[PDB]
mmCIF file of C-alpha atoms in Angstrom:
data_model
loop_
_atom_site.group_PDB
_atom_site.id
_atom_site.type_symbol
_atom_site.label_atom_id
_atom_site.label_comp_id
_atom_site.label_asym_id
_atom_site.label_seq_id
_atom_site.Cartn_x
_atom_site.Cartn_y
_atom_site.Cartn_z
ATOM 1 C CA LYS A 1 22.686 54.891 -59.076
ATOM 2 C CA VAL A 2 19.185 53.146 -58.294
ATOM 3 C CA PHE A 3 20.517 52.217 -54.438
ATOM 4 C CA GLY A 4 19.073 50.122 -52.509
ATOM 5 C CA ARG A 5 16.865 50.685 -48.797
ATOM 6 C CA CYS A 6 19.319 49.568 -46.768
ATOM 7 C CA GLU A 7 22.659 51.148 -48.925
ATOM 8 C CA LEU A 8 20.676 54.511 -48.773
ATOM 9 C CA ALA A 9 20.275 54.164 -44.987
ATOM 10 C CA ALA A 10 24.236 53.339 -45.074
ATOM 11 C CA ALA A 11 25.185 56.113 -47.509
ATOM 12 C CA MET A 12 23.042 58.583 -45.655
ATOM 13 C CA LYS A 13 24.096 57.641 -42.444
ATOM 14 C CA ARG A 14 27.752 58.121 -42.708
ATOM 15 C CA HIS A 15 27.052 61.462 -44.440
ATOM 16 C CA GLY A 16 25.367 62.492 -40.757
ATOM 17 C CA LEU A 17 21.779 62.468 -41.703
ATOM 18 C CA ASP A 18 20.534 59.846 -38.763
ATOM 19 C CA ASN A 19 18.914 62.303 -36.395
ATOM 20 C CA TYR A 20 20.254 65.569 -38.829
ATOM 21 C CA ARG A 21 17.762 69.030 -37.031
ATOM 22 C CA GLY A 22 16.448 65.943 -35.397
ATOM 23 C CA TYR A 23 14.870 63.787 -38.091
ATOM 24 C CA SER A 24 16.142 60.272 -37.879
ATOM 25 C CA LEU A 25 17.070 58.194 -40.467
ATOM 26 C CA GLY A 26 13.746 56.249 -41.274
ATOM 27 C CA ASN A 27 12.559 59.495 -42.104
ATOM 28 C CA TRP A 28 15.887 60.546 -44.860
ATOM 29 C CA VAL A 29 14.941 57.011 -46.905
ATOM 30 C CA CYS A 30 10.814 57.383 -46.684
ATOM 31 C CA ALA A 31 11.647 60.810 -48.237
ATOM 32 C CA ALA A 32 13.976 59.485 -51.065
ATOM 33 C CA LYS A 33 11.886 56.289 -51.184
ATOM 34 C CA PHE A 34 8.349 58.431 -52.521
ATOM 35 C CA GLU A 35 10.510 62.028 -53.502
ATOM 36 C CA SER A 36 12.573 59.989 -56.423
ATOM 37 C CA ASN A 37 12.386 55.571 -56.078
ATOM 38 C CA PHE A 38 16.268 56.041 -54.066
ATOM 39 C CA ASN A 39 17.205 56.460 -58.688
ATOM 40 C CA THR A 40 19.455 59.134 -58.238
ATOM 41 C CA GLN A 41 18.946 60.395 -61.611
ATOM 42 C CA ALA A 42 15.365 61.231 -61.017
ATOM 43 C CA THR A 43 14.609 64.312 -62.257
ATOM 44 C CA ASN A 44 10.423 66.102 -62.365
ATOM 45 C CA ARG A 45 9.586 69.568 -63.028
ATOM 46 C CA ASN A 46 6.852 71.164 -61.240
ATOM 47 C CA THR A 47 4.180 74.021 -62.330
ATOM 48 C CA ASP A 48 6.068 77.006 -62.101
ATOM 49 C CA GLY A 49 9.066 76.059 -64.105
ATOM 50 C CA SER A 50 12.393 74.480 -61.980
ATOM 51 C CA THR A 51 12.399 71.433 -61.324
ATOM 52 C CA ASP A 52 13.614 69.189 -58.881
ATOM 53 C CA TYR A 53 16.830 67.020 -59.507
ATOM 54 C CA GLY A 54 17.986 63.758 -57.378
ATOM 55 C CA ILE A 55 17.648 61.183 -54.544
ATOM 56 C CA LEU A 56 16.043 64.040 -52.394
ATOM 57 C CA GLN A 57 14.264 65.912 -55.558
ATOM 58 C CA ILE A 58 15.473 69.587 -54.746
ATOM 59 C CA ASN A 59 14.322 72.387 -56.795
ATOM 60 C CA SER A 60 15.699 74.661 -58.696
ATOM 61 C CA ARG A 61 14.100 77.430 -57.507
ATOM 62 C CA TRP A 62 15.633 78.258 -53.949
ATOM 63 C CA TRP A 63 18.400 75.498 -54.167
ATOM 64 C CA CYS A 64 21.231 74.413 -57.760
ATOM 65 C CA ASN A 65 21.504 76.091 -60.407
ATOM 66 C CA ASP A 66 20.082 74.465 -63.669
ATOM 67 C CA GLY A 67 20.170 77.803 -66.216
ATOM 68 C CA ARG A 68 16.821 77.551 -67.255
ATOM 69 C CA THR A 69 14.300 78.299 -63.994
ATOM 70 C CA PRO A 70 14.041 82.770 -64.729
ATOM 71 C CA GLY A 71 13.770 84.447 -60.864
ATOM 72 C CA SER A 72 15.222 81.906 -58.448
ATOM 73 C CA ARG A 73 17.985 81.298 -56.026
ATOM 74 C CA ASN A 74 20.924 79.033 -56.237
ATOM 75 C CA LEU A 75 21.486 78.353 -51.954
ATOM 76 C CA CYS A 76 23.211 75.174 -52.276
ATOM 77 C CA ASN A 77 25.649 76.518 -55.066
ATOM 78 C CA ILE A 78 26.279 73.880 -57.360
ATOM 79 C CA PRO A 79 24.800 73.020 -60.577
ATOM 80 C CA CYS A 80 21.490 71.540 -60.573
ATOM 81 C CA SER A 81 24.040 68.262 -62.703
ATOM 82 C CA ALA A 82 25.605 67.415 -59.010
ATOM 83 C CA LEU A 83 22.958 66.548 -57.664
ATOM 84 C CA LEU A 84 22.184 63.303 -59.548
ATOM 85 C CA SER A 85 25.898 61.690 -59.393
ATOM 86 C CA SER A 86 26.306 58.283 -57.942
ATOM 87 C CA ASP A 87 27.929 59.475 -55.242
ATOM 88 C CA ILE A 88 24.544 61.194 -52.570
ATOM 89 C CA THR A 89 27.587 64.073 -50.887
ATOM 90 C CA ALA A 90 26.031 66.815 -52.684
ATOM 91 C CA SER A 91 22.815 66.571 -52.853
ATOM 92 C CA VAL A 92 23.345 65.148 -48.703
ATOM 93 C CA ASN A 93 25.376 68.708 -48.827
ATOM 94 C CA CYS A 94 21.851 70.734 -49.903
ATOM 95 C CA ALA A 95 19.581 68.928 -47.826
ATOM 96 C CA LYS A 96 20.743 69.883 -45.426
ATOM 97 C CA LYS A 97 20.611 73.405 -46.488
ATOM 98 C CA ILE A 98 17.164 72.784 -47.018
ATOM 99 C CA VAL A 99 16.199 71.192 -43.587
ATOM 100 C CA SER A 100 17.888 74.073 -41.527
ATOM 101 C CA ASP A 101 15.899 76.868 -43.415
ATOM 102 C CA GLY A 102 12.925 77.042 -40.737
ATOM 103 C CA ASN A 103 10.243 74.212 -41.816
ATOM 104 C CA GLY A 104 11.718 70.945 -41.447
ATOM 105 C CA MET A 105 11.680 68.270 -43.693
ATOM 106 C CA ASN A 106 7.973 70.075 -44.475
ATOM 107 C CA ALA A 107 9.802 71.167 -47.256
ATOM 108 C CA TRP A 108 9.118 68.090 -48.985
ATOM 109 C CA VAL A 109 6.298 67.195 -50.041
ATOM 110 C CA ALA A 110 6.231 64.041 -50.174
ATOM 111 C CA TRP A 111 7.530 63.885 -46.405
ATOM 112 C CA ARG A 112 5.368 65.368 -45.351
ATOM 113 C CA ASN A 113 2.408 63.801 -47.202
ATOM 114 C CA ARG A 114 3.475 60.298 -47.281
ATOM 115 C CA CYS A 115 5.441 59.892 -44.672
ATOM 116 C CA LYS A 116 5.480 62.449 -41.549
ATOM 117 C CA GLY A 117 3.690 60.496 -38.303
ATOM 118 C CA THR A 118 4.184 57.382 -40.274
ATOM 119 C CA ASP A 119 6.189 54.641 -38.548
ATOM 120 C CA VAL A 120 9.497 55.885 -40.531
ATOM 121 C CA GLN A 121 11.941 53.320 -38.312
ATOM 122 C CA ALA A 122 10.282 50.273 -40.610
ATOM 123 C CA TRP A 123 12.250 51.710 -43.758
ATOM 124 C CA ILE A 124 15.376 50.844 -41.784
ATOM 125 C CA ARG A 125 14.254 47.096 -41.195
ATOM 126 C CA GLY A 126 16.448 44.734 -41.503
ATOM 127 C CA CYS A 127 19.820 47.483 -42.235
ATOM 128 C CA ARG A 128 23.336 46.324 -40.827
ATOM 129 C CA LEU A 129 23.892 50.088 -40.176
#
């Protein structure tokens, strides 16, 4: 599913990500924009042999099981393919664990390099939320 911007904002807000661990909704929308372009089906292989999955590009070393990343963990206890679903519940549940892990949203490299410090509220402009 390719979410619209405000579509995604609404769903993230309903699933409790607005200000989760202190990160406003626009931070999460910005992260999703640059991680996946709002496409739930996005997958991208990392140099280390892990893969990132879904709307928030959750990597398969620490976070989900894809059966092909030797040495990795599965800290969200889910198949990585479940992170590609049209319903973002599993991705949000897992993202809550990731952002709680100690470095906040810096865990998302696109967020640190493209969102952090910027006017992230722009990402929720216009939305009836």
